[PDB]
Design a protein around this ligand. Sequence first.
Ligand SMILES: *C(=O)[C@H](N)Cc1ccccc1
Ligand SMILES: [Ba+2]
Ligand SMILES: [Ba+2]
Ligand SMILES: [Ba+2]
Ligand SMILES: [Ba+2]
Ligand SMILES: [Ba+2]
Length: 362
Amino acid sequence: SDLNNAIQGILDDHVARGVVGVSLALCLPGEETSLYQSGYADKFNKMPMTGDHLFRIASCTKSFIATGLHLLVQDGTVDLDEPITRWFPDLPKAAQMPVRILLNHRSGLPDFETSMPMISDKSWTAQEIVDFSFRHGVQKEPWHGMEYSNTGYVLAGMIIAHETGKPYSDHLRSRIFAPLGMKDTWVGTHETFPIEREARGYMHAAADDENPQWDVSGAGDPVDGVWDSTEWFPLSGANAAGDMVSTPRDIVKFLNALFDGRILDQKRLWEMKDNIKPAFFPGSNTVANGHGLLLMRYGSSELKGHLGQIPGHTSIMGRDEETGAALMLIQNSGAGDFESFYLKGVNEPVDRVLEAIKNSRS
Ligand SMILES: *C(=O)[C@H](N)Cc1ccccc1
Ligand SMILES: [Ba+2]
Ligand SMILES: [Ba+2]
Ligand SMILES: [Ba+2]
Ligand SMILES: [Ba+2]
Ligand SMILES: [Ba+2]
């Protein structure tokens, strides 16, 4: 179709901007998921990008951890409004923290991501990340305002583990991945994944990487304007804040089924997507968030989903509610600065695709 050719052109023009490669999955209403890739999975081997190339989905992981949590609310074991002291009695200010503030980025919890070395071979415990957060981060009061929290999702994961007796990966697999047919999806912290199948991740030495968001010391020297950051960071360091590996095809499987009532009941879905407050993420299109989903505005279209940044892989997923379209676009180009073209610029092809969808619908 004309749409098919318009979309492949958007991806081609984006990789021509300097982006190593991009993988997209797009489901439109009354249609099968159609996949589009451009550029390379492996810059130096010139391997073409396919729809079978795995990516680290980074904070997109967060939409699954919320779902898993919401599933345990349906199970009757967890209450969104009850204090987390039940699970974390010694956590400062815990009594002011209902289960929902873990998910909604209003908890005031101190964060770990900006202090955590991105290059290491160190494995992390959930608790180890939490002690790290309080040691290096800044704690604000609950409900102070919106400030993106990874720590809240790490704590969310620990609730899941305690309530189900097994690692949070077991719950997400048995309740989400398995019944949906998601066969190319792993939870990094607790599961091994086929490294050989992953698209390589590229950090660009770019002029606009003026204010790196990560401690990337130990990177060594670049080669042909990039570092291969694929295996820089152990996923156990991100934990429930961003440890999942997947394909855009598998993610669209999840999204269609979530927005289609087939995972979460109508009340848990409403919490996730409709019970919202204003939200900010530096260099993104985020305007609001629920309890697991960021609302990201692209001109006259909006996606409910998530952004993901982990060194070298850069992802945007969501559903457009006005049009029914689901999409996961991931590039294997990244940088550190939020405002870098290599991070913030992933939003441009996403915008253009939603414009092409809209125009083909008129
Ligand atoms: C979301 O994309 C967060 N940046 C994921 C993350 C990555 C590293 C360490 C903690 C959280
Ligand atoms: Ba600087
Ligand atoms: Ba390493
Ligand atoms: Ba509109
Ligand atoms: Ba409107
Ligand atoms: Ba038209």
